[PDB]
Amino acid sequence: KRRRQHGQLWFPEGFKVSEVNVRGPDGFTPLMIASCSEEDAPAVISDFIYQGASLHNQTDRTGETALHLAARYSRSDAAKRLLEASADANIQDNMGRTPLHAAVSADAQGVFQILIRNRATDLDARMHDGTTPLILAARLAVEGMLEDLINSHADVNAVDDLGKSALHWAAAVNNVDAAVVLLKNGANKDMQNNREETPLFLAAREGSYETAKVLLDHFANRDITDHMDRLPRDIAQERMHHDIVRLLDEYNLV
Amino acid sequence: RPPPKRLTREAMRNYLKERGDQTVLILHAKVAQKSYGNEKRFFCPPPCVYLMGSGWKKKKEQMERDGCSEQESQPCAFIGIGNSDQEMQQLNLEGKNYCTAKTLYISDSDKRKHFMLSVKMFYGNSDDIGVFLSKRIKVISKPSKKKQSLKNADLCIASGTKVALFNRLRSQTVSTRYLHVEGGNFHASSQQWGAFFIHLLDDDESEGEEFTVRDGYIHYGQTVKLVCSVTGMALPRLIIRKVDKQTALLDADDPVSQLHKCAFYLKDTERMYLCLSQERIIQFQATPCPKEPNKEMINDGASWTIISTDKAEYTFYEGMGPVLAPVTPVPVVESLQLNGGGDVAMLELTGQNFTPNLRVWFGDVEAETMYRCGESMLCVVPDISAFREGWRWVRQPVQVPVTLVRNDGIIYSTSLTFTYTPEPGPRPHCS
Amino acid sequence: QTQRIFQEAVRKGNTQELQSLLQNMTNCEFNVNSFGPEGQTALHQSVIDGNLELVKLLVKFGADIRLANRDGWSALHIAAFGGHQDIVLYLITKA
DNA sequence: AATCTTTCCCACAGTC
DNA sequence: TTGACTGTGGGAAAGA
Numbered sequence: 001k002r003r004r005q006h007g008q009l010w011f012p013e014g015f016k017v018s019e020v021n022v023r024g025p026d027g028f029t030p031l032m033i034a035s036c037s038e039e040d041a042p043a044v045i046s047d048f049i050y051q052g053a054s055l056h057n058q059t060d061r062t063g064e065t066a067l068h069l070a071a072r073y074s075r076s077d078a079a080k081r082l083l084e085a086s087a088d089a090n091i092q093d094n095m096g097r098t099p100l101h102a103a104v105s106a107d108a109q110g111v112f113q114i115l116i117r118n119r120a121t122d123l124d125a126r127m128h129d130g131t132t133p134l135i136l137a138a139r140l141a142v143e144g145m146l147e148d149l150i151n152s153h154a155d156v157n158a159v160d161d162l163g164k165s166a167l168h169w170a171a172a173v174n175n176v177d178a179a180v181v182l183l184k185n186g187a188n189k190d191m192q193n194n195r196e197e198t199p200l201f202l203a204a205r206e207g208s209y210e211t212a213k214v215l216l217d218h219f220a221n222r223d224i225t226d227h228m229d230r231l232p233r234d235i236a237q238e239r240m241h242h243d244i245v246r247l248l249d250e251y252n253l254v
Numbered sequence: 255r256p257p258p259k260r261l262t263r264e265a266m267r268n269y270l271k272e273r274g275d276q277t278v279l280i281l282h283a284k285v286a287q288k289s290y291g292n293e294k295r296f297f298c299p300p301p302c303v304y305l306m307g308s309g310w311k312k313k314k315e316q317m318e319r320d321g322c323s324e325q326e327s328q329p330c331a332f333i334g335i336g337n338s339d340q341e342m343q344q345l346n347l348e349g350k351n352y353c354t355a356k357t358l359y360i361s362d363s364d365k366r367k368h369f370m371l372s373v374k375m376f377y378g379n380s381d382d383i384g385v386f387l388s389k390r391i392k393v394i395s396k397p398s399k400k401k402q403s404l405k406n407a408d409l410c411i412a413s414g415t416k417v418a419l420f421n422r423l424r425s426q427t428v429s430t431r432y433l434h435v436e437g438g439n440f441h442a443s444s445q446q447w448g449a450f451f452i453h454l455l456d457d458d459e460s461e462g463e464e465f466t467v468r469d470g471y472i473h474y475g476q477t478v479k480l481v482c483s484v485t486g487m488a489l490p491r492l493i494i495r496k497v498d499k500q501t502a503l504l505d506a507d508d509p510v511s512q513l514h515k516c517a518f519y520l521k522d523t524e525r526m527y528l529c530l531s532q533e534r535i536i537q538f539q540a541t542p543c544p545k546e547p548n549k550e551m552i553n554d555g556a557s558w559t560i561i562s563t564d565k566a567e568y569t570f571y572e573g574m575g576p577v578l579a580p581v582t583p584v585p586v587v588e589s590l591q592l593n594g595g596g597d598v599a600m601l602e603l604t605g606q607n608f609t610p611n612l613r614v615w616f617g618d619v620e621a622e623t624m625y626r627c628g629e630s631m632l633c634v635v636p637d638i639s640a641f642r643e644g645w646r647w648v649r650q651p652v653q654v655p656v657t658l659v660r661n662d663g664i665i666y667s668t669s670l671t672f673t674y675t676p677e678p679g680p681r682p683h684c685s
Numbered sequence: 686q687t688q689r690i691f692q693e694a695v696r697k698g699n700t701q702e703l704q705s706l707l708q709n710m711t712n713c714e715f716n717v718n719s720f721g722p723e724g725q726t727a728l729h730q731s732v733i734d735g736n737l738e739l740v741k742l743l744v745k746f747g748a749d750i751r752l753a754n755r756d757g758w759s760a761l762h763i764a765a766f767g768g769h770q771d772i773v774l775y776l777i778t779k780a
Numbered sequence: 781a782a783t784c785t786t787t788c789c790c791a792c793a794g795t796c
Numbered sequence: 797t798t799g800a801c802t803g804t805g806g807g808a809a810a811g812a
Contacts, residue, residue, distance in 0.1 A: 001466060005414075005453065007481040007488030009462045010440055012537050017523045018490070020780060025676055025757040026651075030765045030773075033678050036595075039768030047770060051777070061651070061673060062592070072595045095591055105602065106594040129589060129604060139630060140593075172627035206628055227368040227390060228337060290787060294803060359803095362787085395786045402784085425792055427803045499806095649756050678758045679766030680733065 020052060027059035035070040035078035042077040049085040056088060063094030064102070071102040076110025083114065089121045096127030104136045104145060112145060116152045123154040130160035138170045138178035146178055150185045157187060163194035171203035176210045183218050190220060196227045204232040204244050212244060216252045258661040259574040265663070266618045269573050270655070274309025275667050277569040280388045281449060282371055283418065284562045285409070285512045288393050290362045298430065298513075299418050299447060299561055300354035301371055301388070303331065303345065309571060316576075322379055329383060332374040336387070338364060342374060354445070360393065368392055384582030389564040397513035404471055410509040411472045411562060416449035416483060419558045421530055431530060433558075435482040440489070442530045449483035449563055455491060462490060474506040474516070483565075492518035492528065494560075497552055502527070502540065505548035515557040529556050574663020583609045585658050587668050596682045599635040601672075611661045616672055617641070617654035638674060648677045688714055696727040701738050708746055717747055724755020732763045737771045750779045 021029055028036075031053050034045045049055070058065050067087055070078040079099075083089065089099050100121060103111040115121045124132055131139075134154045137146040150156060156166055167187050170178035179199075183189065190198055200220050203212040223231060236244040282301040289295045317327045333355045334342035345353045360369070368390045375383035398409060411417060421442075423429035432447035433440070454468040455477045465479070472478060474496055481488040495504045495517040502517045510516065518528045520537070529538035529552075542551035568584035586606045593600035603614065610625040614633040619641070622634040638648045652674040658666040695703060718726050728748050731739040744750060753759055764772035 001468060004465055004467055005451070005481070006463045007479075007486045008438075010438070010487045010489060012440075012528070012535060014537065017520065017526060019522045020777070022751075022759045022761055024678070024753075024759060024762055028678065028762070030761045033762050034765035037679060037766040037768060040770045041768030044765060044768055044770045044773060047773065048765065062675065069595075072592070074594075095589070097591070102592075105592070106598070139626065140632075169627070169630075172629075202627075228370065229366045230337070288786095289803095296803070298804095398784075400784060422804070424794090425804050426794065428795085429793095676756070678762040 021054055021057075026061050027057065029054065029057045029066065031055070032057065032066040032069055035066045035075055035082065036073050037075075042081070045078045046081050049081055055082065055085060056091065058091070058093070061094075063092075064097070065091050065093070065099075067091070067099045068093060068097065068102050071099045071108050071111045071115075072106045074106055074108040074111065076108065076114055079111050079114055083118055089115060089118060090125065092127070096129070098122065098125040098127070098133070100125060100133045101127060101131075101136060104133045104142065105140065107140075107142055107145075109145075112148070116148055123149055123152060124158060126160075130162075132158050132160070132166070134158060135160065135164075135166045135169055138166050138175050138182070139173060141173055141175040141178065143177065147181050150181065156182050156185055157191065159191075159193070163192075165191045165193070165199070167191065167199045168193060168197075168202055171199040171208050171211045171215070172206055174203070174206070174208035174211045176214060179211050179214050183214070189215065189218055190224060192224070196225070198224045198232070200224075201226060201230075201232045201235060204236040204241065204248070205239060207239070207241050207244065209243060209247070212247055213251065216247065219252070222248055256578055258579075259577070259663045260661070261573050261615075261620075261659045261663045261665065263618055265573050266615060266657075266659075266665070269571060269657075269665055270618065273667075274312045274571055275307045275569050276309040276313060276571055277305075277307035277567065278375075278386055279304035279306055280371070280373065280386065280566040281447075281563060282388050282391065282566070284389070284391055284564050285394055286360055286369070286391045287397075287513065288362055288395055289359050292361075294359040296356060296427070297358055298420050298422075298559065299432065299563065300356035301333065301358070302352060302354045302447070303373060304352045305347075306351075307569070317377070317379075317381075326378040329375055329377050333358065334372050334374070335360070335364075335369055336372045337366065337369070342372075352446075366393065381576065382578075382580045384580035386566070386568055386582070386584070388566040394512065398511040399514070401508050402511055404509060407509065407511070409512045411452060411560070413454040413467070413469060413472055413478075414451060416563045416565060417452050418447055418450060418561050418563050420447070420561070421555065421558060423555060431532075433535075435485045435487050438485070438487055440487070440535050442533060442535050448485070449565060451481045451483060453479045453481065455479050459491070462488065471509055473509045475504060477521075489528075491521060493521070495519060497557060500552055500554060500556075502550040502552040502556075503548060504550065510560065512561060514560050516560055517552060517556060517558065525550060527552060527556065529553070531555070569667045571665045571667065572663070573659070573665035577662040577664065579662050581664050583607055585609060585612060585666055587656075587658070587670060590656065590670050590672075593632065601633050601635055603631045603633065605629055605631075609660070612658050612666075613661075615657045615659050615665075617656075619654075620659075635672075641674075647680050647682060648674050651676050688712060689716055689719070692716060692719060692727050693721045696731060696739070699734060699736060699739070701736075701742070704739065704742055708742065711746075718749055718752060720755055726752075726754065728760055729754050729758075729763055732760060732767065732769070732772055735767055735769045735772075737769075737775075740772060741775060744775065744779060750776060 031048045034048045067082050100115050103115055134149045167179055167182050200215050233245055233248045280303050283299045287295050331345035332342035347353055370390050371388040373386045419433045421431050431442045431444045434443040434446045435448055454472050455465055456468055459465045474494055477491050478494055495502050496506055497515050497517045525540045526537040527540055540550055540552040570581055585608045587603055589604045591602040593602045606629050608628050608631055613623045614621050619636050621636050624632045626632055638645050641652055654672050656668055656670055656672050728743050750760055761776045764776055
């Protein structure tokens with residue numbers, strides 16, 4: 001109840017009836033640039049974190065902070081002393097990215113292993129489009145980065161704003177290593193999104209042979225209608241994926 | 255047969271100059287009343303296909319510059335439901351910029367809960383344009399006219415959604431006159447209709463054009479404001495009231511479900527309700543109120559039936575000449591994210607209807623692109639040297655456009671602009 | 686005229702003796718903080734090189750520390766990006 | 781029960 | 797003119 005969407009009036013006949021931390025360009029702070037880069041740069045970041053340094057400073061354009069820059073550029077040494085300096089790990093940028101999201105997207109192995117071992121770090125963080133880091137790890141098919149979140153007790157049965165699950169994206173990109181570990185750690189085999197679609201449907205749409213094979217190994221129900229009563233065989237024959245149809249006609253019946 | 259043609263640099267510069275977007279627009283309601291047996295209850299608001307965009311005229315020139323008649327160069331359209339081969343009805347665009355499909359029906363033989371309209375388009379000279387689909391439409395048996403509630407309902411009207419209003423004169427099919435806005439004038443045209451935002455307003459507000467909006471689902475007896483989506487010409491505050499049997503009912507706290515015969519009341523305006531006199535809209539008296547203070551006898555021409563409506567849009571352009579492959583997969587980009595920095599500066603694209611035969615273009619620079627899935631694609635940001643030759647590193651922010659290009663050269667337009675982030679230090683990640 | 690293009694060409698040699706000699710006699714043109722070819726003063730590119738004696742002599746001879754270069758960054762940003770810890774010491778001490 | 785969704789069933793007011 | 801149809805709305809009937 002704050003915004004307003006104006007227009008322009010119009011009436012029929014007769015209306016009388018109414019009766020030292022230098023701002024610099026953008027939003028970059030000296031500690032941010034220190035975390036972005038015998039060069040004792042880790043020691044430089046350490047000395048920067050002390051004294052009168054403001055850790056929580058967001059970018060004017062991208063909205064990111066110092067920890068976000070340390071996660072994107074894969075500077076794990078900076079993020080170490082940042083977290084030791086009582087920094088925040090649940091700061092949303094202009095796009096909703098938490099530092100964990102930037103660490104997973106940029107394939108920052110060290111920052112990832114440091115963030116999962118932190119207590120206050122959120123693992124079910126939801127961005128603007130609600131995508132969770134556990135979903136990003138399967139979307140980018142980064143090896144090893146997925147199971148470390150599940151062993152850290154992350155929500156595998158999570159949904160985004162649309163309602164897609166981690167297994168949905170694992171079936172879309174055909175990341176067999178993702179879908180296998182998800183289903184082994186208690187992923188819902190027949191979860192329906194807001195559009196009433198199963199992971200097998202998305203696997204058959206984009207030609208995911210191996211992921212559909214794994215879902216059939218884990219006894220996924222082939223006969224689930226979508227919002228238009230289309231079975232995965234229907235979309236497979238529509239997209240002309242004959243081998244997927246043969247898998248839906250032979251492999252692991254009853 | 256013509257092979258695929260990669261989009262060149264100067265063709266992209268020409269696109270940046272001219273920008274002849276051949277946009278395709280589809281307005282259609284979100285709810286469809288189902289027909290039983292052999293009946294044929296048509297969609298009260300006919301699906302309206304617009305063809306906005308200047309580049310369309312350019313398409314008229316080039317084809318006519320290659321020996322095509324005015325009848326041959328005119329795009330014929332077909333409308334149909336996808337899952338059934340019950341023949342696509344024909345749409346003609348002789349000298350019009352749009353058209354409405356008013357002879358569509360959905361039989362009970364199709365037990366689908368939702369569906370979506372399919373539009374085939376091709377020119378008279380057999381050159382295919384392609385198949386464009388609209389947003390989903392929900393099937394309904396009968397409007398929820400009873401005293402519904404908010405607990406699990408979702409077919410009511412949210413403040414800020416595109417709606418439409420129509421009329422039915424004494425159960426006559428041809429008497430349907432739709433609400434439209436054109437030339438700064440509110441018309442009751444039986445051939446056109448626009449998208450109307452409906453905003454719930456507090457009982458205490460201002461005169462107009464500036465107001466405190468209100469959230470929540472819309473019920474009867476409240477104060478609403480109607481605003482056309484394109485023109486912007488708004489109406490003064492109105493109060494929606496459900497009517498039945500030429501009698502308006504005001505004392506009602508029920509939610510406004512779909513396909514409802516509502517009435518609009520002006521504050522301190524006696525009983526003057528917004529009615530239609532044949533061709534134009536006029537305020538009508540509706541005096542009798544003898545049975546109950548909450549029962550006003552309103553004359554015919556007043557059963558304004560309300561229905562929500564969505565909007566599908568697909569914009570593109572032919573940057574490498576017309577190709578044989580149809581442009582039926584139109585990618586849309588809802589948002590653009592980041593993936594790394596420095597030498598591994600990558601971008602994640604979240605959208606819909608992506609195709610593996612697509613490549614991103616940072617302005618006029620071709621970048622390496624990977625196809626993750628039909629709604630997500632990764633790309634590598636090129637070096638700043640491609641934009642500024644002498645620059646070894648990003649000095650000041652540079653705003654370039656981001657577009658999508660198919661293998662054949664069909665350039666798709668986006669609304670997002672990439673911005674190179676300025677870097678304090680010179681050489682990054684020297685190795 | 687020719688004396689103005691001396692510092693912008695002599696600072697690219699990393700010679701402290703020549704700097705101390707040409708600055709002991711000082712100069713009259715009062716070039717002082719002088720934006721170079723890349724718009725970076727001798728202070729900024731001296732921080733880029735990473736030698737504490739040059740930057741200290743510059744700060745000694747009236748070189749303002751809290752000035753933004755042509756692109757908009759101060760002297761602290763380049764010192765933080767380069768990793769030289771000894772430069773930020775004197776950049777913070779001068780405040 | 782008091783609501784609700786889903787199928788038929790049938791009389792206006794007009795066009796064919 | 798009379799004869800065979802026709803989209804639209806409303807109430808009875810049928811489940812839930």
